Design a protein around this ligand. Structure first.
Ligand code: 774
Length: 327
């Protein structure tokens, strides 16, 4: 599409306020200061939006996310607080912005814009004051069954929304589910591993791709086989096990590579706690089928998990409350 050219050149070299579609087109050229901000509350100043000039990170800089790359920040002009994820330009994948720009769902963290500055791509988004589901598991040890189901339910609604639009999330895990301040709303974040799937519907380990979290990789990812939206379902069920047990599946002592065991061993259904209700155990098993064609889709599993939650009397347990011992 060469008539983008003229629009994209107008965007280049500048930070502007604009719409999602413009950000996506600019981001395709990211393989000094430029980008698009999608909300009123972040404003460029004279064609620029520069760290520690127009926006500032919180003063004791601590960092969340796997690489401590996510920070709380404040626009200096407006005072509005939000989150920024820093990504190294040389590793930036176009899909991180092309897949999520223009999505609108309460199960997906809102994108506020992205700005390139030197060797950084700064991705701005809503600051969810409840923190991540990963932080919650760490803080509480492990989650009771009803709360685990509730959050898996919401993640699956997010995945239905993405899969319907031919978007594979690619790193579904507790760390990438963010929570409102009261714990009642969960939403998917981090599209660094996302992939746009073909019309047909249904490769991964080729070209510019960056693999997800290893303990959560489906067998077909690890075997180099063709990959589709079912990869996310496997991955969400490894998250469920993490919620219930307080640790990732496949964690336990062994030397040598874990990717071999995921290929060769049976699925980690033995880690399902014996005290789970039967529909909870059944659902996790249907999401953890080794062959993607035998695995539940997002829609199917979402219905089942909603039923499982009703089967245990609905969401009753406290938001935070009491430490539960893992293992
Ligand atoms: N936006 C927030 O409030 C927020 C808080 C904590 C986070 C994150 N986001 C993100 S964004 C992309 C990845 C991650 C990893 C989890 O750490």
């Amino acid at each position: 599409v060469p008539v983008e050219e003229y629009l994209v050149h107008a965007l280049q070299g500048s930070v502007s306020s604009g719409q999602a579609h413009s950000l996506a087109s600019l981001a395709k050229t990211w393989s000094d200061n430029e980008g698009v901000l999608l909300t009123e509350k972040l404003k460029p100043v004279d064609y620029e939006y520069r760290e520690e000039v127009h926006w500032m990170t919180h003063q004791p800089r601590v960092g969340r996310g796997s690489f401590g790359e996510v920070h709380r920040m404040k626009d200096k002009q407006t005072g509005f607080q939000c989150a920024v994820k820093k990504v190294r330009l040389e590793v930036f994948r176009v899909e991180e912005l092309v897949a999520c720009a223009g999505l609108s769902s309460p199960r997906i963290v809102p994108l506020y814009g992205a700005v390139r500055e030197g060797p950084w791509v700064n991705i701005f988004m809503e600051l969810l004051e409840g923190g991540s589901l990963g932080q919650l598991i760490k803080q509480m040890g492990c989650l009771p069954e009803d709360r685990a189901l509730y959050y898996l339910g919401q993640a699956l609604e997010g995945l239905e929304y993405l899969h319907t639009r031919r978007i594979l999330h690619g790193d579904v895990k507790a760390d990438n589910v963010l929570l409102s301040s009261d714990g009642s709303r969960a939403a998917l974040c981090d599209f660094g591993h996302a992939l746009c799937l073909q019309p047909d519907g249904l490769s991964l380990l080729t070209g510019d791709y960056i693999p997800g979290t290893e303990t959560h990789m489906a067998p077909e990812v690890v075997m180099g086989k063709p990959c589709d939206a079912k990869v996310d379902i496997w991955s969400s069920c490894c998250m469920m096990l993490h919620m219930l047990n307080g640790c990732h599946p496949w964690t336990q002592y062994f030397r040598g590579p874990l990717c071999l065991k995921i290929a060769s061993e049976p699925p980690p259904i033995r880690e399902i706690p014996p005290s789970c209700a039967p529909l909870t155990a059944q659902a996790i098993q249907e999401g953890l089928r080794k062959e993607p064609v035998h695995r539940a889709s997002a829609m199917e599993l979402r219905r089942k998990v909603g039923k499982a939650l009703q089967e245990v009397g609905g969401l009753k347990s406290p938001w935070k409350g009491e430490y539960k011992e893992p293992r």
